[PDB]
């Protein structure tokens, strides 16, 4: 893992020592090459998971996320190349440094072996993301959005710290292999239930549960494009990954401590998907779509069947890529019309015919088009939940209908219809934007070709 971490660190010296002219090109290129290097973690020809040292490890669950993180950084730089067009060189380099630091910390987090590695490297992500939202955001309420994002997560996390310390005192260690191979059954004492909650709540907040999902619609419509991309591609999955790694010890309490959160997920999914129908902000609509998908992920993880885990992982990756693409597209139209309303710009298929194609493909990934890995994930989660209780199909079906509905609503409202001819400023699509969308789609298509890579530990 240290053949992937160190190049990432060295990106920073490159960013700061490069000449002002070539800095963007150099960092983008070397970040792509770091992404290439990260593929070495897919040479798992045996069931023995990789453990590169006492500190860093990898698994079938961590390799896809690490590779996704590596892949995102070049795309984040391309997406940020524009709105930073007229800032001073040091400020541009600061932005690039923030993104590089975010990648470093996230890779280390996903590759951490001890949960008190994880608890530090997980919260260290707050600083770069908070800076990205607050400093380079546009509208005034970005400060409030930053405050929400910081403190929701910190309130969630502190109880996680307490629980982890108790765990270490009780067990003697926090290496996840050791916890897995020496776990023991919890008893249904009230203190154990309180623990279960303390361990699970920070991750559930980062996987915004229906009742604690108010920090996404704000953080996203106040954050720049790169912030939104990294956030709702990787940060949101920190919660799922933590939950998956930590639930091993917290058994058998889950059987009855999951009813509340399963119910909240399976209801908030419908509520948020419906909210997407009548929202006048494209960024917000995408954010609430993300909330619904993470609701599904949470339900599956909290039922813990092999299908649940594998489908949850698949959908984690699929949502990463798809939501990222959607946000880049919306930012594309925003960079021109300088507004976030969906109603304002319409019929843009009459002037951006190809970007309309990318819009269509993204909407299909969102609505879950077979055989796309997005569908595969949702289908397998549905099978798991139906096994868990055969009545969940009602909620699942209502959500499927509404998902298709807002997914096509975006397209019809924006791409189709009479062109708002008064928009003189609409300019031909930049090769940068088109290449960004292509780099988002092509990995999705290749993984749909080869799903075996993105299955979880179970399958």
């Amino acid at each position: 893992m240290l053949k992937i971490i160190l190049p990432s660190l060295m990106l920073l010296p490159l960013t700061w020592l490069s000449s002002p002219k070539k800095t963007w090109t150099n960092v983008t290129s070397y970040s792509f090459l770091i992404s290439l290097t990260s593929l070495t973690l897919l040479w798992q020809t045996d069931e023995n998971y990789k453990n590169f040292s006492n500190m860093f490890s990898s698994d079938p669950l961590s390799t896809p996320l690490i590779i996704l993180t590596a892949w995102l950084l070049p795309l984040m730089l391309m997406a940020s190349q524009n709105h930073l067009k007229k800032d001073n060189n040091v400020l541009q380099k600061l932005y690039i440094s923030m993104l590089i630091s975010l990648q470093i910390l996230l890779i280390m987090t996903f590759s951490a072996t001890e949960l008190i590695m994880f608890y530090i490297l997980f919260e260290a992500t707050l600083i770069p993301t908070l800076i990205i939202i607050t400093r380079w955001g546009n509208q005034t309420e970005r400060l409030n959005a930053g405050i929400y994002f910081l403190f929701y997560t910190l309130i969630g996390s502190i109880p996680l710290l307490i629980a982890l310390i108790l765990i270490q005192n009780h067990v003697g260690t926090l290496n996840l292999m050791i916890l897995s191979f020496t776990t023991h059954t919890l008893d249904a004492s009230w203190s154990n239930n309180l623990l279960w909650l303390a361990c699970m709540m920070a991750f559930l907040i980062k996987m915004p549960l229906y009742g604690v999902h108010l920090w996404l619609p704000k953080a996203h419509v106040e954050a720049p494009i790169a912030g939104s991309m990294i956030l709702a591609a990787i940060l949101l999955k920190l919660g799922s990954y933590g939950m998956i790694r930590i639930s091993i010890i917290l058994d058998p309490l889950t059987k009855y401590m999951a009813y509340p959160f399963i119910l909240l997920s399976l209801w908030g999914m419908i509520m948020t998907s419906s909210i997407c129908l009548r929202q006048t902000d494209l960024k917000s609509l995408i954010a609430y779509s993300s909330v619904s998908h993470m609701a599904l992920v949470i339900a599956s993880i909290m039922i813990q069947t092999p299908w649940s885990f594998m489908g949850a992982t698949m959908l984690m990756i699929a949502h990463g890529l798809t939501s990222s693409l959607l946000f880049c597209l919306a930012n594309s139209n925003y960079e021109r019309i300088h507004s976030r309303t969906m109603i304002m710009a319409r019929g843009l298929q009459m002037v951006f015919p190809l970007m309309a194609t990318w819009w269509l493909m993204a909407s299909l990934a969102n609505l879950a088009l077979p055989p796309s890995i997005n569908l595969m994930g949702e289908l397998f989660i549905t099978m798991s939940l139906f096994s868990w209780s055969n009545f969940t199909i009602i909620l699942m079906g209502i959500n499927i209908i509404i998902t298709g509905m807002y997914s096509m609503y975006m397209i019809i409202t924006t791409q189709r219809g009479k062109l708002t001819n008064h928009m003189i400023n609409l300019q031909p699509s930049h090769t940068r934007e088109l290449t960004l969308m292509a780099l988002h789609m092509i990995p999705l298509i290749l993984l749909t070709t080869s799903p075996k890579l993105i299955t979880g530990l179970t399958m």
Binding site: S189, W190, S191, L194
Partner: protein, 140 residues
């Protein structure tokens, strides 16, 4: 003596209601008097009769919260068959919060206090069953 306060847990809840209500009322009154002494020592009032009215109001309010809490907790534990179930202390703490809201003439305090005081009481009961220890002594 501290015997009076430690007698609260002589017999599980649902029994000796009147005694437990007395004990919680006394504890609430003591807390109220302490708070009133602080609130008069700082932020003085114009009249000494105003100060004594303030101490009376604080003391009576705190005593009322404590009395309602004890009464409702014991009544719940008695009417339902669960003596040591923290939901009872939660309902009692909610009753205390609602009484505070009434005393202050505000529904927002009623709701916030219900949630917070009920959680505090439930956690207290859970601690007493599970053996938690506040203010421990160095064991290392």
């Amino acid at each position: 003596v501290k015997r009076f306060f430690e007698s609260y847990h002589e017999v599980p809840d649902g029994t000796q209601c009147h005694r437990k209500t007395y004990i919680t009322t006394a504890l609430g009154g003591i807390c109220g008097i302490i708070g009133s002494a602080y609130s008069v020592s700082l932020n003085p009032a114009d009249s000494t009769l105003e100060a004594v009215a303030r101490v009376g109001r604080y003391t009576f309010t705190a005593a009322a919260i404590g009395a309602m809490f004890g009464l409702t907790t014991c009544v719940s534990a008695q009417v339902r068959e669960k003596p040591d179930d923290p939901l009872n202390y939660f309902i009692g703490g909610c009753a205390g919060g609602l009484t505070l809201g009434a005393r202050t003439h505000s529904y927002g305090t009623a709701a916030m206090g219900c949630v917070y005081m009920g959680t505090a009481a439930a956690l207290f009961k859970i601690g007493k069953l599970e053996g938690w220890e506040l203010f421990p002594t160095p064991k290392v």
